[PDB]
Design a protein around this ligand. Sequence first.
Ligand SMILES: *[C@@H]1O[C@H](CO)[C@@H](O)[C@H](O)[C@H]1NC(C)=O
Ligand SMILES: *[C@@H]1O[C@H](CO)[C@@H](O)[C@H](O)[C@H]1NC(C)=O
Ligand SMILES: *[C@@H]1O[C@H](CO)[C@@H](O)[C@H](O)[C@H]1NC(C)=O
Ligand SMILES: [Ca+2]
Ligand SMILES: [Ca+2]
Length: 478
Amino acid sequence: SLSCRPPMVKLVCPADNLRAEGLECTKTCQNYDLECMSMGCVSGCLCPPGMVRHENRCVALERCPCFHQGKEYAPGETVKIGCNTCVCRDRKWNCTDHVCDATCSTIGMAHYLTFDGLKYLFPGECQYVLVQDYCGSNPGTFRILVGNKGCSHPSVKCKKRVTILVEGGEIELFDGEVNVKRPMKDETHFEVVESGRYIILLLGKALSVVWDRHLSISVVLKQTYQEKVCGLCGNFDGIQNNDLTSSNLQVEEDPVDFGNSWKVSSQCADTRKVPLDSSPATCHNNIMKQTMVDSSCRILTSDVFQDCNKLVDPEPYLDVCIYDTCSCESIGDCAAFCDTIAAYAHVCAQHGKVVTWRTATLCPQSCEERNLRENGYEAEWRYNSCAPACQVTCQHPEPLACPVQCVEGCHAHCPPGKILDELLQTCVDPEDCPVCEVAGRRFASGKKVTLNPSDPEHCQICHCDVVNLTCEACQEPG
Ligand SMILES: *[C@@H]1O[C@H](CO)[C@@H](O)[C@H](O)[C@H]1NC(C)=O
Ligand SMILES: *[C@@H]1O[C@H](CO)[C@@H](O)[C@H](O)[C@H]1NC(C)=O
Ligand SMILES: *[C@@H]1O[C@H](CO)[C@@H](O)[C@H](O)[C@H]1NC(C)=O
Ligand SMILES: [Ca+2]
Ligand SMILES: [Ca+2]
């Protein structure tokens, strides 16, 4: 019987003893909080009770590493998921609980998906506060309103109007175009980016809107606005179960009650409650169509979406897909079907799981129509499931802090060393853009850049005629 290296102690297995546990019940950094059942003990040397065997030596239990998705991380080695960091300390994952940047989203005709993940139905026909920071003791910087007309009982034909009020300006989203009714007092960080199917609005450093030009309206807030906003999109605090809090700080169990409390004009009437129809318009008493709609919308958890289903819950997009498609006479050309599915694929792509799902049979989209090679336009337009959203063009010469990584649609491809000119729909040399530069910032002709906004002695508003740059001092408002 040769001695064992400390602190391991030997275990002679007695055959004449009823039960015994040897090396078969060895405890490592993996199987510690588990139980063992030995057919017969294996004689050998094992670590003392307080320790576990790890890498052929006895280690303290607290010195055990943590495991994340199979990979081993030493104690102290942090992993970052989202905007939170998880430190490995004492064989445990200690994670921060910070609220990350969030997105409010209108899904489909009459559903809303709040910043904190609450999905509810609210078929209001008036104008409502989508998101605003005028809540109680308010700084009061921005207010975004949404008006729904035709998204009620007949949802086949519906149109929405979004009104954006920020920094003294009013930007309205309606009928697939952006209308800047009143400019922001400082346009330096204001951009209207048309990319693919979408229009991306930069409304300052921390407020953005992503819009598919029809009914998918998203507000992207940075986490500095947490607990500071209210309206149909909730209070943005990481707690989903309190987003149905009305304007009078009371939790409402019915979404129709919560939504009516955010009605803007007292002229129109509040929405009255209706019992939830599990089979709306064309699915009512039609088990055949309910099966067709369920099978079509079930693409959201099919193969191409399986990777994304782990990162982004498809349940709310699937509920909305089924509810809205039940208003279409045909699922092939159904607009509510493709838009809702595309809205999910868009969120997937923001999490690094770009999903190519369209086909010529199902929701086809091609760029062949606007590929005018033989017409004097030098630009090739190719569809991409997710291409960089904020590309440098003559109209956006400085690189932008884009609220989304990429978007779906048609994107122009230019020869090496050439930049897209959006107004001319053709590729041009970067020197040929009507673009000025000041303070290291390039801005397009007609854009106004404000230098030192808060400094009355150095505030300047710079204008770009074509390539001509002129700056003027600001006027003290008195
Ligand atoms: C994580 O660290 C904090 C201190 O930052 C401590 O209060 C908390 O108990 C730790 N949690 C775990 C599970 O180690
Ligand atoms: C889309 O663009 C990416 C780069 O942004 C490229 O790698 C990919 O091959 C493109 N796919 C299609 C179908 O154009
Ligand atoms: C630029 O503007 C100045 C006056 O501000 C004018 O004298 C000059 O001719 C302009 N140059 C061009 C190229 O337009
Ligand atoms: Ca909340
Ligand atoms: Ca620069």
